[model samples]
Target: MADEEKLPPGWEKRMSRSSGRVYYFNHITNASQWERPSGNSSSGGKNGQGEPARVRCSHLLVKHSQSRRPSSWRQEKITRTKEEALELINGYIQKIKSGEEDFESLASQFSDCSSAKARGDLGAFSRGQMQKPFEDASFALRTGEMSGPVFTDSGIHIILRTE
Candidate 1:
């Protein structure tokens, strides 16, 4: 079979002047957890996989009857159409490209990772620490430059190129 394709219909490659150093400050919570079935005996077993499971936190498995709604964790509420998210992310990217902002500061504001508090400072990482699209993008940028925003299912981001 042919290789699976990912980029959208009209996507085009643009030249980048990046130094290829990637930073992975943090990760957003995966949204898939919310869609999973609890062990309440109501949903008929662990997301239909029939695995003997109970929800737990830190080695404390609180069976169905004793638990309440996953303790109210939170994330920033970013509500926008794919286009809008892309636009917002891209705007920051352009600023980086134009030298209006540096990588760390912009990552804090634009990247949703917890490391945003530390100015989105992703500590050193080797290749494969991040997804391929991101890794490739990072490798494409020049030192002190930034790339346009790229959207993943999780959301949008502005990646800075740090050598």
Candidate 2:
């Protein structure tokens, strides 16, 4: 069988003439790496920041009094303290991981975001379309990867990346 296989769109495999070791190169912008490009073909596999073009995710959000607008679709005005929201959201994460509860089920019942009505379904979206930390969590997550609390201007969030 051929050792050469399909590669990340911009990457190629070659051998080091001097050391006879395998290395990878990306001619697109003239860069090379000691590591093979791993992940789906669409993953550019550069600086570990190769963000996907789009991502689908759901999140359970809890807002606090200090949050930018201090109000949520669930409440006319959020009066809970940040610490309280953090505690509640962390509990949610534990429940999800414990298998006693699930993300969508809890999110639909308790999330503060308007999307809570749809079980926190944020839909597929491109990069920079969300707050920095939230966007990073969404992009960083693999399909079906569930992440714990991420803090943002809005409040605390639990992101569950779907396909």
- Which residue runs does candidate 1 get wrong by more than 4 Å? 1-76
Candidate 2: pairs in clash: none
State how far residue 75 of model 2 sits from its true place (Å): 1.7
Deviation (Å) of 3 in candidate 1: 30
Which candidate achieves the best lDDT against the true structure?
Answer: 2
TM-score of each: 0.47, 0.64
Best by TM-score: 2
Positional deviation of residue 49's Cα in model 1 after best superposition, in angstroms: 47
Instruction: Provide the lDDT at 52 for model 2.
Output: 62
Model 2 scores worst on lDDT over the 10 consecutive residues at 40-49
Model 2, 27: alpha-carbon shift in Å?
Answer: 20
lDDT of 1 by residue, 1-163 (tens): 2222322333333322475433221122221211222222222322333422221100001111122221211233445555665665666656656778655566655455555555654555555666577666765565555556555435454565444
Candidate 2 C-alpha lDDT tens digits along 45-88:
24444456888898988887777876776888886686798788
